[PDB]
Short mmCIF file of C-alpha atoms and ligand atoms in Angstrom, two decimals:
data_model
loop_
_atom_site.label_atom_id
_atom_site.label_comp_id
_atom_site.label_asym_id
_atom_site.label_seq_id
_atom_site.Cartn_x
_atom_site.Cartn_y
_atom_site.Cartn_z
CA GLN A 1 0.00 0.00 0.00
CA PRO A 2 1.30 3.56 -0.65
CA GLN A 3 2.44 5.39 2.54
CA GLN A 4 3.51 8.75 3.84
CA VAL A 5 7.19 9.64 4.16
CA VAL A 6 8.07 12.59 6.42
CA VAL A 7 11.62 13.87 5.85
CA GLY A 8 13.01 16.23 8.46
CA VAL A 9 14.94 19.16 7.02
CA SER A 10 17.26 19.37 10.03
CA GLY A 11 18.72 15.92 9.26
CA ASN A 12 18.31 15.78 5.46
CA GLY A 13 18.61 19.33 4.15
CA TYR A 14 21.63 21.37 3.18
CA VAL A 15 22.38 24.87 1.85
CA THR A 16 23.97 23.96 -1.46
CA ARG A 17 24.48 27.39 -3.05
CA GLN A 18 25.19 30.73 -1.35
CA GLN A 19 25.66 29.28 2.09
CA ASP A 20 25.33 32.51 4.05
CA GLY A 21 21.89 33.15 2.53
CA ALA A 22 19.99 30.40 4.37
CA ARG A 23 20.67 28.10 7.26
CA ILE A 24 19.86 24.60 8.39
CA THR A 25 19.19 24.56 12.13
CA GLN A 26 17.50 22.13 14.51
CA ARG A 27 14.13 23.31 13.18
CA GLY A 28 15.00 23.15 9.53
CA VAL A 29 15.46 26.04 7.18
CA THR A 30 15.78 29.42 8.89
CA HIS A 31 17.52 32.75 8.12
CA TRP A 32 16.48 32.38 4.51
CA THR A 33 17.26 35.74 2.94
CA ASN A 34 19.11 35.32 -0.36
CA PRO A 35 17.12 34.49 -3.55
CA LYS A 36 20.32 32.96 -5.01
CA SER A 37 20.60 30.37 -2.22
CA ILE A 38 19.55 26.79 -2.78
CA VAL A 39 18.38 24.37 -0.15
CA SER A 40 18.53 20.67 -1.14
CA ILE A 41 16.80 17.81 0.64
CA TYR A 42 17.80 14.18 0.05
CA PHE A 43 16.14 10.86 0.72
CA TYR A 44 16.55 7.40 -0.80
CA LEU A 45 13.82 5.34 -2.48
CA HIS A 46 14.20 1.58 -3.12
CA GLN A 47 11.83 1.38 -6.09
CA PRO A 48 10.22 3.54 -8.85
CA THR A 49 7.20 5.41 -7.56
CA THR A 50 5.21 8.54 -7.90
CA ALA A 51 4.99 10.87 -4.94
CA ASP A 52 2.76 13.74 -3.89
CA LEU A 53 5.06 16.36 -2.32
CA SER A 54 4.23 18.94 0.37
CA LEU A 55 6.25 21.12 2.74
CA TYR A 56 5.57 21.67 6.44
CA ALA A 57 6.36 25.34 6.29
CA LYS A 58 5.51 28.89 7.35
CA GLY A 59 6.20 32.25 5.78
CA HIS A 60 4.96 34.96 3.46
CA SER A 61 6.71 34.33 0.21
CA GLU A 62 6.92 32.77 -3.19
CA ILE A 63 9.45 29.94 -3.57
CA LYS A 64 10.44 27.49 -6.29
CA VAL A 65 10.58 23.73 -5.50
CA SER A 66 12.37 21.52 -8.05
CA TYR A 67 12.96 17.83 -8.81
CA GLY A 68 15.51 17.81 -11.63
CA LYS A 69 14.12 19.94 -14.45
CA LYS A 70 10.57 19.90 -13.07
CA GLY A 71 9.73 23.06 -11.10
CA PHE A 72 6.81 24.14 -8.99
CA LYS A 73 5.84 27.63 -7.96
CA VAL A 74 4.78 27.55 -4.33
CA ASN A 75 3.38 30.36 -2.12
CA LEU A 76 3.76 30.39 1.60
CA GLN A 77 1.12 32.38 3.49
CA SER A 78 1.05 31.46 7.19
CA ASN A 79 2.28 32.60 10.59
CA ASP A 80 2.39 29.04 11.88
CA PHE A 81 3.58 25.83 10.26
CA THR A 82 1.10 24.21 7.94
CA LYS A 83 1.10 21.51 5.27
CA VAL A 84 1.66 23.20 1.90
CA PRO A 85 1.10 20.99 -1.15
CA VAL A 86 3.69 21.33 -3.89
CA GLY A 87 2.87 18.87 -6.59
CA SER A 88 3.52 15.36 -7.86
CA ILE A 89 6.74 13.83 -9.10
CA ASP A 90 7.64 10.57 -10.87
CA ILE A 91 10.71 8.85 -9.47
CA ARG A 92 11.71 6.54 -12.35
CA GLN A 93 14.55 4.55 -10.69
CA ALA A 94 15.75 3.58 -7.23
CA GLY A 95 18.21 5.94 -5.62
CA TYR A 96 18.57 9.25 -3.83
CA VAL A 97 15.92 11.85 -4.57
CA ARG A 98 17.07 15.49 -4.38
CA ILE A 99 14.45 18.24 -3.91
CA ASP A 100 15.68 21.81 -4.31
CA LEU A 101 14.16 24.96 -2.82
CA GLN A 102 14.91 28.53 -3.92
CA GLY A 103 13.37 31.85 -2.91
CA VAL A 104 11.61 33.98 -5.51
CA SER A 105 9.77 36.74 -3.65
CA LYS A 106 9.20 37.68 -0.06
CA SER A 107 6.94 40.25 1.61
CA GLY A 108 9.24 40.54 4.57
CA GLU A 109 12.75 39.67 5.78
CA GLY A 110 12.92 36.12 4.50
CA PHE A 111 11.47 33.40 2.32
CA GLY A 112 10.10 31.34 5.20
CA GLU A 113 10.85 28.46 7.54
CA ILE A 114 10.74 24.87 6.30
CA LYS A 115 10.61 22.02 8.83
CA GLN A 116 9.73 18.95 6.75
CA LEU A 117 9.36 17.61 3.25
CA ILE A 118 6.35 15.27 3.07
CA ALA A 119 5.99 12.69 0.35
CA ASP A 120 2.52 11.13 0.24
CA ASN A 121 1.40 8.05 -1.63
CA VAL A 122 4.88 6.60 -1.95
CA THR A 123 5.30 2.95 -2.91
CA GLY A 124 8.17 1.06 -1.35
CA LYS A 125 10.81 1.55 1.28
CA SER A 126 12.86 4.65 1.92
CA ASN A 127 16.02 5.57 3.83
CA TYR A 128 17.03 8.91 5.33
CA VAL A 129 18.01 10.54 8.61
CA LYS A 130 15.19 9.88 11.10
CA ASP A 131 15.25 8.62 14.62
CA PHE A 132 18.92 9.49 14.57
CA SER A 133 21.30 12.32 15.41
CA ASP A 134 20.90 15.11 12.90
CA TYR A 135 24.55 16.08 13.52
CA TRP A 136 25.98 12.67 12.75
CA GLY A 137 23.44 12.03 10.08
CA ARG A 138 24.40 15.12 8.14
CA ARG A 139 28.13 14.42 8.62
CA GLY A 140 27.45 11.19 6.86
CA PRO A 141 29.03 7.72 6.92
CA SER A 142 32.75 7.48 7.42
CA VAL A 143 34.44 4.56 5.61
CA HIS A 144 37.61 2.65 6.34
CA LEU A 145 40.10 0.26 4.77
CA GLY A 146 42.08 -2.22 6.86
CA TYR A 147 45.22 -3.72 5.41
CA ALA A 148 46.37 -7.26 6.21
CA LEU A 149 49.88 -7.54 7.65
CA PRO A 150 52.21 -10.48 7.08
CA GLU A 151 52.98 -12.98 9.73
CA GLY A 152 55.44 -11.82 12.36
CA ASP A 153 56.07 -8.40 13.88
CA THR A 154 55.68 -5.25 11.78
CA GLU A 155 57.51 -2.11 12.86
CA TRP A 156 56.85 0.33 9.97
CA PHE A 157 53.83 0.99 7.78
CA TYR A 158 54.08 3.03 4.60
CA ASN A 159 51.17 4.29 2.54
CA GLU A 160 50.70 6.73 -0.39
CA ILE A 161 47.72 9.02 -0.47
CA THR A 162 46.32 11.10 -3.33
CA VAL A 163 43.17 13.22 -3.08
CA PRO A 164 41.89 13.82 -6.63
CA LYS A 165 40.50 17.31 -7.33
CA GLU A 166 36.94 15.91 -7.44
CA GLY A 167 37.52 14.33 -4.04
CA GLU A 168 38.93 17.41 -2.39
CA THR A 169 36.30 18.79 0.01
CA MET A 170 36.70 21.32 2.84
CA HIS A 171 36.31 19.83 6.33
CA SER A 172 37.47 16.30 5.39
CA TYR A 173 39.92 14.02 7.23
CA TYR A 174 41.90 11.81 4.82
CA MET A 175 43.43 9.40 7.36
CA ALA A 176 46.30 7.51 5.76
CA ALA A 177 48.21 5.49 8.35
CA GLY A 178 46.16 4.45 11.29
CA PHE A 179 47.11 1.85 13.89
CA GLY A 180 45.70 0.20 17.00
CA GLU A 181 46.18 3.22 19.24
CA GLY A 182 45.68 6.23 16.94
CA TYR A 183 45.69 8.00 13.61
CA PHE A 184 47.97 9.75 11.13
CA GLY A 185 46.65 11.66 8.14
CA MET A 186 45.80 14.98 6.57
CA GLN A 187 42.91 17.40 6.83
CA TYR A 188 41.39 20.23 4.68
CA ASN A 189 40.52 22.60 7.46
CA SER A 190 39.88 26.04 5.86
CA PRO A 191 40.76 28.07 2.80
CA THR A 192 43.99 29.03 4.55
CA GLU A 193 44.92 25.97 6.56
CA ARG A 194 45.52 22.32 6.04
CA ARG A 195 46.98 20.04 8.65
CA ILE A 196 49.07 16.87 8.82
CA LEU A 197 47.69 15.33 12.05
CA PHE A 198 49.08 12.56 14.25
CA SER A 199 47.21 11.47 17.40
CA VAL A 200 47.84 8.73 20.00
CA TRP A 201 45.32 7.73 22.65
CA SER A 202 46.29 7.23 26.24
CA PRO A 203 45.45 3.80 27.70
CA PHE A 204 43.52 5.62 30.44
CA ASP A 205 39.80 5.78 29.63
CA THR A 206 38.63 9.34 30.05
CA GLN A 207 37.12 12.27 28.13
CA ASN A 208 39.44 14.77 29.87
CA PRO A 209 43.21 14.46 29.30
CA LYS A 210 43.88 16.39 32.50
CA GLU A 211 42.26 13.38 34.42
CA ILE A 212 44.98 11.03 33.22
CA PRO A 213 47.51 9.90 35.85
CA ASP A 214 50.93 11.24 35.08
CA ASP A 215 52.33 7.78 34.33
CA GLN A 216 49.61 7.12 31.75
CA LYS A 217 49.92 10.33 29.80
CA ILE A 218 51.15 10.26 26.25
CA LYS A 219 54.72 11.58 26.48
CA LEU A 220 56.44 13.75 23.87
CA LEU A 221 59.78 12.29 22.76
CA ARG A 222 60.43 14.29 19.59
CA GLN A 223 58.78 17.27 17.89
CA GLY A 224 59.21 18.21 14.30
CA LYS A 225 60.05 21.67 13.10
CA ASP A 226 56.93 23.91 13.17
CA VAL A 227 54.77 21.14 14.69
CA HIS A 228 52.15 22.02 17.27
CA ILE A 229 51.80 19.60 20.24
CA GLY A 230 48.80 19.33 22.51
CA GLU A 231 46.27 17.04 24.08
CA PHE A 232 42.79 16.08 23.17
CA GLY A 233 39.65 14.83 24.87
CA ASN A 234 35.95 14.18 24.23
CA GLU A 235 36.57 11.02 22.19
CA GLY A 236 38.75 9.35 24.67
CA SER A 237 41.90 11.36 25.37
CA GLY A 238 45.56 11.52 24.48
CA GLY A 239 48.27 13.40 22.70
CA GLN A 240 48.11 15.15 19.37
CA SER A 241 50.45 16.87 16.96
CA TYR A 242 49.99 18.69 13.71
CA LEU A 243 51.95 20.45 11.00
CA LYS A 244 50.28 23.18 8.95
CA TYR A 245 51.13 22.17 5.39
CA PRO A 246 49.45 23.30 2.14
CA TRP A 247 48.97 19.92 0.52
CA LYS A 248 47.51 19.87 -3.01
CA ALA A 249 44.84 17.84 -4.70
CA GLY A 250 46.30 15.45 -7.27
CA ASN A 251 49.68 15.18 -5.65
CA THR A 252 50.74 11.91 -4.00
CA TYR A 253 51.93 12.21 -0.40
CA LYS A 254 53.62 9.52 1.68
CA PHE A 255 52.93 8.56 5.30
CA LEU A 256 55.48 6.52 7.21
CA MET A 257 54.62 5.24 10.72
CA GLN A 258 56.89 3.47 13.21
CA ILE A 259 55.46 1.52 16.17
CA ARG A 260 58.07 -0.10 18.44
CA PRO A 261 57.85 -1.53 21.96
CA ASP A 262 60.75 -0.52 24.21
CA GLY A 263 60.82 -3.79 26.20
CA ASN A 264 60.10 -1.84 29.35
CA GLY A 265 56.36 -1.81 29.02
CA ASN A 266 55.95 1.23 26.75
CA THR A 267 55.56 1.64 23.03
CA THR A 268 56.77 4.45 20.85
CA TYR A 269 54.92 5.94 17.89
CA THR A 270 56.82 8.04 15.33
CA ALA A 271 55.19 9.73 12.34
CA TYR A 272 56.87 11.02 9.19
CA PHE A 273 55.22 12.81 6.27
CA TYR A 274 56.71 13.16 2.81
CA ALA A 275 56.13 16.76 1.67
CA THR A 276 56.09 15.91 -1.98
CA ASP A 277 55.98 19.57 -3.07
CA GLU A 278 59.36 20.10 -1.34
CA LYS A 279 60.76 16.62 -1.97
CA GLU A 280 61.51 16.07 1.69
CA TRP A 281 60.48 14.07 4.69
CA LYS A 282 59.10 15.89 7.72
CA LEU A 283 58.96 14.64 11.28
CA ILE A 284 55.55 15.21 12.85
CA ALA A 285 56.22 13.80 16.32
CA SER A 286 57.38 10.84 18.35
CA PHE A 287 55.13 9.93 21.26
CA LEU A 288 55.48 7.32 24.04
CA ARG A 289 52.42 5.43 25.17
CA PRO A 290 52.79 3.92 28.65
CA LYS A 291 51.38 0.55 29.74
CA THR A 292 51.60 -0.69 26.16
CA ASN A 293 53.71 -3.47 24.64
CA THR A 294 52.94 -3.78 20.93
CA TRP A 295 54.38 -3.82 17.50
CA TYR A 296 52.38 -2.25 14.64
CA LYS A 297 48.77 -3.54 14.63
CA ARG A 298 45.71 -2.62 12.57
CA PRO A 299 47.17 -0.55 9.74
CA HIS A 300 44.23 1.19 8.17
CA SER A 301 42.91 4.30 6.46
CA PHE A 302 39.63 6.20 6.68
CA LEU A 303 37.69 8.98 5.05
CA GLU A 304 35.59 11.28 7.19
CA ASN A 305 33.47 14.41 6.80
CA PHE A 306 33.63 16.46 10.00
CA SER A 307 31.16 19.21 8.99
CA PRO A 308 27.38 18.53 8.85
CA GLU A 309 27.05 21.38 6.35
CA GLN A 310 29.25 19.46 3.90
CA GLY A 311 27.33 16.22 3.92
CA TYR A 312 25.82 16.94 0.51
CA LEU A 313 29.25 16.90 -1.09
CA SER A 314 31.22 13.74 -1.79
CA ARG A 315 34.87 13.31 -0.94
CA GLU A 316 37.25 10.65 -2.28
CA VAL A 317 40.84 9.49 -1.82
CA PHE A 318 43.22 6.98 -3.34
CA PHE A 319 45.58 4.80 -1.35
CA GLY A 320 48.49 3.16 -3.09
CA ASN A 321 51.68 1.24 -2.59
CA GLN A 322 51.14 -0.11 0.92
CA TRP A 323 54.30 -1.61 2.51
CA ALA A 324 55.20 -3.09 5.85
CA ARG A 325 58.73 -3.40 7.33
CA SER A 326 59.24 -6.20 9.81
CA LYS A 327 61.16 -5.76 13.04
CA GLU A 328 63.90 -7.80 11.30
CA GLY A 329 64.11 -5.22 8.54
CA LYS A 330 62.27 -6.86 5.63
CA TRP A 331 59.84 -4.99 3.45
CA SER A 332 56.60 -6.67 2.24
CA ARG A 333 53.99 -5.23 -0.17
CA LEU A 334 50.49 -5.44 1.31
CA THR A 335 47.73 -6.58 -1.01
CA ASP A 336 44.56 -7.32 0.97
CA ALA A 337 42.16 -4.66 2.19
CA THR A 338 38.93 -4.95 4.10
CA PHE A 339 36.26 -2.23 3.69
CA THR A 340 34.13 -1.15 6.61
CA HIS A 341 31.73 1.70 7.39
CA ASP A 342 30.74 3.53 10.53
CA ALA A 343 27.60 3.41 12.70
CA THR A 344 25.73 5.96 10.66
CA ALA A 345 25.93 3.63 7.68
CA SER A 346 25.04 0.71 9.95
CA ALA A 347 21.87 2.59 11.11
CA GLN A 348 20.97 2.79 7.29
CA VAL A 349 20.15 6.47 7.62
CA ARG A 350 22.85 7.26 4.97
CA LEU A 351 23.62 4.97 2.03
CA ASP A 352 26.35 7.01 0.40
CA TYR A 353 29.37 4.92 1.48
CA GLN A 354 31.78 3.20 -0.95
CA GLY A 355 35.26 1.94 -1.49
CA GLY A 356 37.15 -0.44 -3.73
CA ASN A 357 39.69 -0.65 -6.52
CA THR A 358 40.94 1.96 -8.90
CA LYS A 359 42.04 1.01 -12.38
CA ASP A 360 45.68 1.78 -11.50
CA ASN A 361 46.29 -0.73 -8.72
CA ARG A 362 45.19 1.48 -5.85
CA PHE A 363 42.38 1.36 -3.38
CA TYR A 364 39.80 4.15 -2.94
CA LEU A 365 37.31 5.39 -0.39
CA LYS A 366 34.36 7.66 -1.19
CA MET A 367 31.49 8.95 0.96
CA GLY A 368 28.96 11.72 1.09
CA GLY A 369 27.17 13.38 -1.79
CA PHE A 370 24.16 11.09 -2.02
CA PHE A 371 25.35 8.65 -4.62
CA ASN A 372 23.52 5.39 -5.23
CA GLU A 373 26.05 2.55 -5.09
CA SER A 374 27.16 1.34 -1.73
CA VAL A 375 29.54 -1.39 -0.58
CA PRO A 376 28.78 -3.73 2.24
CA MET A 377 30.61 -4.06 5.59
CA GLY A 378 33.56 -6.47 5.35
CA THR A 379 33.97 -6.45 1.57
CA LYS A 380 37.47 -7.51 0.60
CA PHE A 381 39.53 -5.83 -2.12
CA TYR A 382 42.92 -6.77 -3.50
CA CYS A 383 45.77 -5.07 -5.30
CA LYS A 384 48.67 -6.64 -7.19
CA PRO A 385 52.00 -6.81 -5.38
CA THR A 386 53.74 -4.32 -7.46
CA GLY A 387 55.06 -0.90 -6.59
CA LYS A 388 58.31 0.72 -5.62
CA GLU A 389 59.77 -0.48 -2.34
CA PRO A 390 60.39 2.49 -0.01
CA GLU A 391 63.95 3.71 0.11
CA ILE A 392 64.21 5.68 3.33
CA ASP A 393 67.31 7.50 4.71
CA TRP A 394 66.73 6.19 8.19
CA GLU A 395 69.57 8.06 9.78
CA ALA A 396 68.50 11.40 8.33
CA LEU A 397 64.98 10.87 9.69
CA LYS A 398 66.33 10.23 13.17
CA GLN A 399 67.99 13.70 13.11
CA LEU A 400 64.81 15.62 12.33
CL1 LIG B 501 48.14 25.22 5.02
#
């Protein structure tokens, strides 16, 4: 039987053009002043269906509601929210449906306030952000790749990362060389700042790093030139370091990560970044983690959107030439990757999660942007064991 689908704007809407000219808040669209702004609302349908669209809206305005090339002229004329019919659409294939809103005329300060998109008489199942955090839902589903290590003890992991131009999106974390106790990667933080970030969690479970007993704090051993060192909390706690570095889309950067137990019940974590634009290795930091006795475990990568406002945009990254160096000093090319997704994907509130193979013997991750092909949890991907073995001037690195 056809059914009603109520899509909340706060979890499913985005300002997609002229971002200062409207806003998505906990009640949906507000502060809607600029006729050039576009608001887009996304929800997924499993099968072809018609739908009778309405908005739950208030205002004194004329707006334009669009599904592809089909537009509707819609007046708002209310001081309180009411159901405002728009018109009918024909969804010809499964996938994400995008509904756009644009202001045309207003009698007062703004074009109105839009709380919900309502689709009546819809056949089949749908997926979107409901009964779920609007913050996490709009951030969208992070995705990860885990690389299989050889037998024995690995000390170093090496990975190459390239963010293609089409995958370069502000407020993304492109995490290249993760491990059992932390992360090492690069961020696109603002128009003027990008960071190479390296973080290690304390073994002490707390949200406040100042709660950690002295003997369980992450300890700084080495600090690279121009690197900022601090602590973090609110996601567990530990030590962090970053270098401001203007990395470029389309360039291939290298991440080299050493994890070595000291035999005295600690483990050290040392992160190096190859600044391809300068043709030189940079030290980020070396940190000691107490109460830890491990070699390298769980080499992995991830792709994350950390801004809810950016959830309507995709981001994408390529990972190539993965190598492990054993504690005995032997390099091995890694070939086997396992794809996973985060809890937002698991909740099925966002379906725009993907990863796999490129056509040039790399792996990729892609999420956000409301695409239609997903990849399931645990999918395995493989690359051929080809690629240039790292040639590292070990001694030079030790002197950074
Ligand atoms: Cl920068």
